[PDB]
């Protein structure tokens with residue numbers, strides 16, 4: 072029913088967020104292990120992001136998919152808001168990529184398949200994530216990808232602007248430009264992730280914000296020699312300036328490079 076902080080024993084920090092921290096926690100009666108995303112009311116209020124927090128909570132609450140992190144509940148006290156999340160025990164894809172440097176084709180196709188299944192479910196409800204990046208991709212007990220952090224999620228179509236000075240690396244041209252956008256934004260982010268998984272760095276990475284913006288807007292990227300023909304084909308289809316030219320998620324799931332390398 073109605074949770075309070077006294078119902079949990081808090082453990083180690085699991086990760087740092089923009090508006091507070093995520094902690095491992097145990098519900099006192101059941102001993103059930105979960106993650107508490109803690110946000111500071113004063114920081115949320117100064118930034119004026121309460122409306123986006125309401126969307127994170129309302130959207131994530133109603134999603135039910137094995138590759139989407141569950142949001143079980145929420146509560147608040149005088150200074151903080153607490154999101155009760157499903158705990159992802161194998162950490163982030165971000166950490167996995169720092170350890171391994173780059174992923175082989177099998178691990179990449181498997182993660183892309185899991186991501187495409189999760190996004191296909193979101194898009195069936197016109198929910199667009201818009202913040203698909205390695206730090207927001209968690210790993211379950213079976214090493215399965217779980218999409219998390221619905222902080223920027225909205226119902227499609229939308230023209231809302233997400234980050235003002237944060238990383239642009241995963242954003243499509245229509246989002247960085249402030250244009251109307253839809254489900255196709257997640258398809259572009261899928262292409263950026265596929266490239267980063269195989270190469271170790273996102274395709275439009277640059278020293279400055281303006282140079283990253285320029286690269287994204289002109290779709291300026293090249294492949295290192297080791298990237299195979301099949302991976303180049305899928306990435307080139309996803310990274311199209313025109314969102315209408317981006318494939319459907321069923322086309323990604325049936326791509327010959329995906330079917331040849333996916334774990335299933």
Ligand SMILES: Nc1ncnc2c1ncn2[C@@H]1O[C@H](COP(=O)(O)OP(=O)(O)O)[C@@H](O)[C@H]1O
Nearest residue numbers: 085086087088089093106156157158159206220
């Ligand atoms: N349920 C979870 N299980 C494990 N680690 C988590 C969980 N949720 C978040 N984290 C960790 O905390 C970080 C921040 O959480 P996130 O929800 O993305 O916050 P923010 O909206 O501030 O980005 C993640 O990038 C990850 O490192």
Ligand SMILES: N#Cc1cc(-c2cc(C(=O)O)cc3[nH]ccc23)ccc1Cl
Nearest residue numbers: 112115116121124125128145146147152
């Ligand atoms: N549970 C919960 C929750 C609480 C707030 C909130 C409440 C108040 C309040 O009722 O006083 C003040 C606030 N300032 C920033 C957030 C915020 C927003 C979302 C959720 Cl999910």
Ligand SMILES: O=C(O)[C@H]1CCCC[C@@H]1C(=O)O
Nearest residue numbers: 089090120123124127222223
């Ligand atoms: O910290 C959060 O969960 C969200 C609060 C609303 C604004 C966006 C923000 C985020 O995920 O970046």
Ligand SMILES: [Cl-]
Nearest residue numbers: 118119120121
């Ligand atoms: Cl605002």
Ligand SMILES: [Cl-]
Nearest residue numbers: 166167169170
């Ligand atoms: Cl380690």
Ligand SMILES: [Cl-]
Nearest residue numbers: 126224225226
């Ligand atoms: Cl919305």
Ligand SMILES: [Cl-]
Nearest residue numbers: 285286289291
């Ligand atoms: Cl140039």
Ligand SMILES: [Cl-]
Nearest residue numbers: 285287288289
């Ligand atoms: Cl241009």
Ligand SMILES: [Cl-]
Nearest residue numbers: 294295296297
């Ligand atoms: Cl070549």
Ligand SMILES: [Mg+2]
Nearest residue numbers: 088206207220
């Ligand atoms: Mg995050």
Ligand SMILES: [Mg+2]
Nearest residue numbers: 220221222223
């Ligand atoms: Mg977030």
Ligand SMILES: [Mg+2]
Nearest residue numbers: 271272273276
């Ligand atoms: Mg990097």
